[model samples]
Target: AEQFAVGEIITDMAAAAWKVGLPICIYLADMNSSESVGSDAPCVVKVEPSDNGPLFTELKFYQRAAKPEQIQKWIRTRKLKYLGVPKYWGSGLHDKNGKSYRFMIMDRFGSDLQKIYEANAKRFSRKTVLQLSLRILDILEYIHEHEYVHGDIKASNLLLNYKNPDQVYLVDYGLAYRYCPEGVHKAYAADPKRCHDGTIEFTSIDAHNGVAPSRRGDLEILGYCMIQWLTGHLPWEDNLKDPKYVRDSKIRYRENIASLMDKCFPAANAPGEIAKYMETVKLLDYTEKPLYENLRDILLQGLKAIGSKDDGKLDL
Candidate 1:
């Protein structure tokens, strides 16, 4: 059902990659990366692997991104489209001669959101950070309303266009899921280990648990990234690479995350704002009504919003 005319190949993997049913001869040189997917921009292309062949389907990544187990219910009833909301331009598979092979095909972004946060978070004196945060959260709200979470909402996954930082792209929904209903009760400390999934720095407290993706989880991570952008540092980032230290570090963080936030955040009131907006435990009911509303405001103004809803999600 999906295919595209031969356009441009930006990477070497394109020829071997299948798109719907033809070889993707185009390559994206700068965007190709083994370390991660597009670090700075969202690539656009047609989806749908080839029709014929017992060959592998790169669509598997998309299917997996949408969470296969959740799709099974819809599949059993033959309602694949209803399983989850479709993403725009997330195609990464290419086609070959009369048969489609699911080998690696590459895509590149003009740039990613990292450029925006890096360039304007502290630089723009007026509306850059506020607008950027609101737009990103708006996108998040849209996705969450669709019943899924952008499981990997890191700065790297956020794509910025080649010419502008204002245009942002949310990349890599491979870890996204529609499993968590509004108030389902599940173990919060056993899922990540069960699936062995999630990016360490971007993951939530429920990462090690089978907590199922929640709006709360998404907001928490988003807020974490926001703080990182504004402060040029993350709370436990110092402890990220060394696994031997991660366990002990996380334990310490769990005990006094407030202290950690204060140490890393920028202002006297920043820690309190962190607790109010980002700390995921029990701030659902806040000085501001819906947490997302307050989060929107915080993204606009930092410590200044400690007692003010003017910065978080007040407008959300």
Candidate 2:
């Protein structure tokens, strides 16, 4: 596609512009039926933010949800704050002249967390991961304080401020729901009665079993994400994990918590050490250390462990 005249195109198209392929799709099912068609589309465009000032300027793209307005309303009402959550510029489904497609425009994170994670992966330092982890924890604390659970919290869902990696931002609120500690709002609750729309690994035990997601549930996902940052992999899925179906589906998700401990920490956080810290974190009724600082220590120790293990040459 060529750029329009009298206007400039803003976004990092370098990544998407180079990709070539058909959008990969997935079919979800329960006992004997299919749900909706899911797409693993090419990140065809690096739709990012534009430095050019104005009323609004960010990455604009098309996710083509059937109800863009309804989604927008949900974002505002639920108080979901993904730094780069797309805004509804306009949309159309039936070739309605100027509005033939639903376009959601999000203010691009001058740089996203994904890019940072990849770039820094080779040169990753315990301190670096710690700093970022802390920032995310702060954001999560703010979110939890409001009784809204960000059903999805992954490295992919977070973005860094274009100016600094220390300042992180979250993206994607499609799975966000208002919740309460006593009981969650059904609309956004983790009620097994409703559809499941969360990543499997990061989700907690209760969430995997259909209970409405709670503050505790949200933290569980965040905790897993933090652990992944240290080890570079998610720790859960099912032995024969099943996907959630659209209607009356039996949602199944199981974490390999044991395996994670076995491979990473056989002794289960053996006494105030790095592994031990996280074990304590998971069970703590309230955090005493600044959450970010706490996560930083966890990532740092794990990084050290991995680095030392890799750097050592076997005497054999």
Candidate 3:
């Protein structure tokens, strides 16, 4: 929770410990979500490397499904109080130092749930987990409806609103893919090209099978996210370096999801909803449409069991 002020030079272990490498240059030139730079908010130039696969893929997604106007329509039309998908502002090609780059603009987030979870000492309140997971369900449903599957869903990919921390945006479309195209879902098959794709600990069994990302895989990934968010580690945390081991571990627990609950939670304090949700997702084939509404209903049951309800508030 402690670090450098923007533009200040830092001499701390945290700064030394962190670095990132990606196939893009992300610059925070606009310091506010508005035209004025007088506030701490940020709007960004999310540059993409094209002649590229991932960004080109994500660019198509933003163009088709993530338009700011398009998203607000769903919000208003359905009377949805909130949705967690990121807003796409604009993007195009630009020349910089004699080369052209494809770039997109987006809202900058204030913080990520990873650090928030760490700051809270690695646990979200049971109610807090439901709050976060419910909104992610909204995001997955929205994207999957528009034909994309967010192949990743983890704390790091969840960025809180700069203005309203209660609102967390699901981003990182590099792995976002159109698993369904015009009523046809992709075939479920393993590919050596994409074996064990996505974050090792949380990726779906389908991912372990090297199948193309699909609705059921996305939903299963979120189930893994819920377990790790509520409780610090997955049972396979130690074996993360070996995907085969991780995959087998997941296969075993998925076979007996109650055993998963027992391994991750004290037997007395296990969250029934996590196991119930996994079993529900397990019922789907890759060509299936996950019953998203029922999934949200399962989470609501979890919230109510905690003697609370979804007020659309994240306790963070």
Candidate 4:
């Protein structure tokens, strides 16, 4: 009951939120990319209950920022190979019997990096982490420029291309926040009872303190992802059940990043670029645009320190 039928081709999503079914309109942006009932369809369908707000939020993101032409223009303007963001194909409402369902279609992906990480000694090579973060930075810069902040970024949400393994995509926009709407940034404020306790390991300190995730919050989350990808553990790994301990540990570490580096990378110490990236993030203002290119430069410097360069290889 949770899955769409194999041969069902859903009509496109209405740009209007909460708009439900009418007659199904059939308009293919291009006719070739049809959804199918294939055993291993290269397209994916994400189904959710109609009342869920997250799916609707994701629909809005795809409509506003992930359109095919929008993404293509961004890629061409930057002269980049591919932005790590996924393409939005189509979405629509589906009904089976009496219940209503909301679903979106997207490119099918290969295994998530989390599965890959656990299989391979639970650690990524320094080269791998640097290269991965470089690509993710490309994505963060993209979504941020579009006025959205991806509140959650971790390996479980990162999937490789089903066809092209080298290409990675950041998915799941349910937590995406429109921090700036039409050039007006959100005011800084938090309530004790309303703080967003998202993925305990990677949520930004601002989120912990009840502030909405801003652009810097996105970068801060990415910083934590790099640390976990490389080191395979966090200081609060054992006590994720206790949210206070997790948030407190993060605050303490933010105060003294040197200790964070030492504790996480106990044997040989954190890679220079890792510490340097944190230091850069430390200087970041709550509402200012981050030095994203300079952040890329920092990671690229990591590749250099290890006597390598950006060869576009994942080194998995």
Candidate 5:
């Protein structure tokens, strides 16, 4: 990876960048890059104008090796008025030095849910959790209906709208892939060598088996997130370094729900509702359409059981 200097001129169109009214600039706060992938590395960061006015926005850079096709698809979907996705302004920009960076600009969002979760000691109210689940499921349903799967589902990718706390956006479609094309579903097969295409902590069993992602896979990953949010940690967290061990523990967690739930949330017994949702998701086949409405109802019932209200606010 090439070194980047602070205060470097990113574009000559500073005035053009400020035409949107809020003219603010900022330095890079953080970056998510995979140097191992070389030229294809995905470089995402929170940055601002050189003047440091406001959080300018976020930029996700992709090299020639990284398939920009999927990201292009994501931008196209956004153009079609897809909800729960960030606004894609445009791309094709260069940084200070002279290296060309194929970049896409997105709405600058506030901290991600993962950061919020950690700030609050890894606990969220039942109301917030249910609302998050509903909104995320809504987004996932839309993606699936469009024949795409958000191959990765985790807290870090779920972010709160900068100005609207109630609104959550799912960012980073680098791993997003088309599961069905033109309404025809793809066939399912497992490749042991490539079984681990996503984060080991919350990937679906199908994903762990290297099968193509489907609607159920997204929901299953969300279920793991739900359990983790309800409790501080998952049983497999300790074994994340070993994919086989993580997979085995996830299998056990799925098979022995009664005991696993007890161990996951011993302080309160109500968190087990997430396990029920996982069970339902597990019953779905790779090509089968998930029971989206039924799943929502399951989450709603859990919220009701926990005496949570329909506040419609997602703030921590």
Candidate 6:
């Protein structure tokens, strides 16, 4: 039935020792760390042993629901490989009870940006916001150039590398789509049933129309994230309880940026640059490539206006 058993130890210690040359602790879910199954939850293990101590690593598992070959392609691509993406170790291994699961190993990470944002009173400084935007846009640009659209782009999917605070990673390629294959773009078509395939409050208009995710959609999601990071809320944030209200608010947000910003961020005017970003992204067609530098510069302009410098650091 494609259901994962919770609280179950999936990997046998002896089998892991033989397979990876080290003892591994793999579970279907971790209540303390993460409530969800697969990549979001952390499976513990030591990558190697030393005289002084063991080198611990956090592993993410994905069930066989997704096309494994597509994931394998991501790891093998040079652009994504260099963008701090988790390294693909291997998969098709069995659990302790002989149930099969696929796994990938990568460096452990600290709390996601969302948690960090919440801990810090839901607002990041202009410096922190600009740096985060830069890092995320860099990752997105690279992936887009290689013809992929990360259908899902949100704070929870952006993680900080445990070893290097300067290196932030974009994880969860579960909803990624290859919009352009062999240099040929896919046609734009809508499906009412698939209209909302992503997180509703931040999803792009194309996603609302049930069309395939494009580069523009990724930018739109990023734009929403930026607004939230800067203002601590979005126009549609309060309307999340009702999908129709959220969807209508999104359309209204596009129709009238000033009103949305004023209402959402009355104290600060909601950062015009982000509104400009949303306006720009909203105009792009499904097959069009975004002017990556132009969009990045819009955020950079905001950073500059705030007397902040992008010293290439995430000082949060």
Alpha-carbon TM-score of each model against the true structure: 0.57, 0.49, 0.87, 0.88, 0.72, 0.71
Candidate 5 local lDDT, residue 274:
79
Pairs in steric clash, model 5: 25-48, 25-49, 26-48, 26-49
Candidate 3 lDDT, tens digit per residue, 104-223?
Answer: 666777789999999999989888899998889889989999998888888989999888988999988875777778968778775444433889999988888778888998999999
Q: Residue 28 of model 5: what lDDT?
A: 29
In the range 1-316, model 2's lDDT, one tens digit per residue, is: 2111112222222221121222211111111112221233212222212222111111221233212464455457646433233333321121223332222223334455556567766233444554455455555665555445567787778765444444566666545555544433444334543465577656655565566665555656666665565556542333216434311121221123344455543355421233444454556432122354455456456546655422212111
Best by lDDT: 4
- Report, for every candidate in turn, its global Cα lDDT versus the true structure: 0.47, 0.42, 0.78, 0.79, 0.64, 0.63
Q: What are the candidates' C-alpha RMSDs?
A: 10.5, 13.9, 7.7, 4.9, 9.3, 9.3
What is the per-residue lDDT of model 5 for residues 1-316, given as tens digits with 9 covering 90 to 100? 3323432323322322211111122222222222121221122233332332112212321222123355456548655222466654433344445444333334566778899899999988767888888878767876687667776788899987766778887876655666777888878975333233778899888777778778888888898888788778888898788989988887887787776777777755656557778778878877999878788888888778877754666757
Scanning candidate 3 in windows of ten residues, the lowest lDDT window is 12-21
Candidate number with the higher lDDT (1 or 2): 1
Q: How do these models rank on TM-score, best leading?
A: 4, 3, 5, 6, 1, 2
Candidate 6 segments whose C-alpha is farther than 4 A from its true place: 1-82, 95-98, 190-196
Cα displacement (angstroms), candidate 2, residue 124, comes to 4.3
Question: How displaced is residue 262 in candidate 6, in Å?
Answer: 1.9
Write the number of the candidate with greater TM-score, choosing between 4 and 5: 4
Tens digits of per-residue lDDT, candidate 1, 83-200, equal 2222322343446455452323333445555665566543322234444456566656655544456666776786654444345556665456554345343334444423533577
Clashes of each: 44, 10, 0, 1, 4, 1
lDDT of 4 by residue, 1-316 (tens): 5344334345665542221221111111222333324434455557778887888888889878888889999899988888888888778877777888777766667789999999997898988888889899999998887888888999999999878888899998886888878978778875343335458889888888888888888777888888888888888889988878988998899889889998988776668888888889888877888998999999998899889999889999
* Candidate 5: segments with Cα more than 4 A from true spot: 1-82, 93-99, 190-196
Candidate 2 regions off by >4 Å?
1-106, 118-124, 181-194, 234-262, 265-316
lDDT pick, better of 1 and 4: 4
lDDT (Cα) of model 6: 0.63
